[PDB]
Each structure stands twice: as C-alpha cells, then as structure tokens.
Amino acid sequence: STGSATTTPIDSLDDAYITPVQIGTPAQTLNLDFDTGSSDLWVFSSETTASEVDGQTIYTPSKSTTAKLLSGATWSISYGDGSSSSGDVYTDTVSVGGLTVTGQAVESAKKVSSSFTEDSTIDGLLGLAFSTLNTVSPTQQKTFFDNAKASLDSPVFTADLGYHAPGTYNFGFIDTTAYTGSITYTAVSTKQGFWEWTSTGYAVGSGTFKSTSIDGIADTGTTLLYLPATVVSAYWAQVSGAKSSSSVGGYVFPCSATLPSFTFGVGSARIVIPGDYIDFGPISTGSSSCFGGIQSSAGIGINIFGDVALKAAFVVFNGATTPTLGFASK
C-alpha cells in the first residue's frame, strides 16, 4: 500500500505545516502537524477542556463507530518549545492520503497548553519519530508509520515541504519526479528515539565549505534550523547589522538585508538553503528588525534540522531494519 497527502503552511512564514488526516467512522478530518521529532498522535477532542479550545476542529470519539477506549491508558507530553498536552486514549481507524491504519492509538487531549489553544490552525500532532518516544502509559503505543510499515510497498515515508507553498508527505514509495539529481543516504542513530544523523559540514553563501561533523535530528515539527553557536555566529557575521538579541531571544537582522544562503553537507552531497528561507519577518508588526531562521542550539542540548533546512530538500525517512535518512535537492 501507499499514501500521499498534501501538507500546507499554516501562515505566511511557514511556522508549521498541516496535513489532513481522517479519523474514525464516518471520517472526521482533522488538520495535524506531522512531527518527525515526536511519536504521539494526539488531537483536540470533545474531551478537551472547553476554555482551552479556540477554533480547532475536534475529534468526537462517541460519533465514531470504530472508536474504542483504550482502557486505563493516559498520555502526557512536553515539547522543546515548552508547550504541552495530556489526556486519555482511543483506538480508531486513521487514514492519511489514502493509506489506512486500523487500531491506531488516537490520543485525546483533556488539557493543552496556551500555545496550542492560541493556534487555531493545528488540530493536533501526528508523530513520526520512533515509537520508543511514545508517551502512552502503561502500554506504550506505536506511531502511524510504525503501524503502517509492514503493509507499505516500501517501509519509508518522504517529506517534501514547500517554501511559502504546499508540499507533500508520501508513505510507502519514493516519487522520483519530486527531486533533482540523486538521493544521498546517511546513517541514522535511533538511540534517542529521533531521526538522528551527522551532517558533514556547512558553508555560508559563496564561502568555502567547512568539513565538520554536526550531529542533529531531522525534525519536521520544528520551524527553524538550530545549530552550534560557532556555526550560527559564522552565518550571521555575513549579514550587516545582524546581532544576537537577548531581549528577543535570538539572532535578528535588519529587514533591509539580503540574506546569504546556507549550505549543509549530507555525506559528499550538499543541500543549499536559499537566503530567503532564513527570513522569518519582523519581530513584531511594523518592526524593521527581522527574526533569523538559523539560531543557536546552545542550551537546547541537540542540533535540530527543522523546516528551514528540510524544506530545501526532498527527504526520505527510511524505516528499514537499519533506518537511514536520504536527502536530495529539488
């Protein structure tokens, strides 16, 4: 089997991407944030504290003939941005772009943090990291991908995120028309539950490539590119007027600037992030100070190849017995 779904930026900055997901019978379609950095499929629901729901579409398990309470199961998760959610669990039928999983754990939110309430466009998350990170207790649950895997034509999914435009998540096949050149595959460590890999280095603009190992995770659920402070300093030093602002919480730059590209290494191959991708606009409406799309990972504890990086590539998440990651230009 295969599946193919369009993923759409939630706003003009590509702060996140939403993908329609069918849950239950008859289908209830919710727009979920596909997150290769977590492993819970959770939704706004009829159980969510009413004061914490503001415009989201909710899952109502009582209206689904295929929903079954997973008795005794609870979940609770906190994300790197400080947001969180928690609740109980149902199993139900879940379909993504024509690909159907029966008995999928659907984690129903009773509580969500303000960040989620305030974002009317995201109805929940669909985790695509390794199932070892799933937070359901006392019986850990599998991700959608994990459940689908054995049925897929090939045990893979691909992320093809657009710049200020829709893109695609495919399951079970590699669309050879969706990228240019060849796909370069690189080793993955699953020891922390993430799609963790090692970049072979970087360049700033037309500068020379610096060969250096950068361990990080491929994370579709993170907006920006978070890299070591040395790397990030070298990038922003090429932008006149750019500075790290403690008050704003990262590197800012004059909105009148032209940003250089940023290149990262995948094995012997190179992915080029155009400068425009690194512009996240005024820090507040009307400001001439703009927020940078490359930021320091110092104090996160891990480097994160978030959407800024991934949207410059066609990315293969290969879930074969020995998982790997593939990157192609596009």
UniProtKB/Swiss-Prot annotation:
Major enzyme class: hydrolase
EC number: 3.4.23.22
Catalytic activity: Hydrolysis of proteins with specificity similar to that of pepsin A, prefers hydrophobic residues at P1 and P1', but does not cleave 14-Ala-|-Leu-15 in the B chain of insulin or Z-Glu-Tyr. Clots milk
GO BP term, example: proteolysis
Catalytic residue positions: 35, 199
Any one Gene Ontology molecular-function term assigned to this protein's record: aspartic-type endopeptidase activity
Domain called Peptidase A1: residue spans: 17-328
Superkingdom assignment: Eukaryota
UniProt keyword list: Aspartyl protease, Disulfide bond, Hydrolase, Protease, Signal, Zymogen
Cystine pairs: 255-290
Protein family membership: Belongs to the peptidase A1 family.
Protein name in the entry: Endothiapepsin
Gene that this sequence comes from: EAPA
Residues of the full protein shown: 90 to 419 of 419
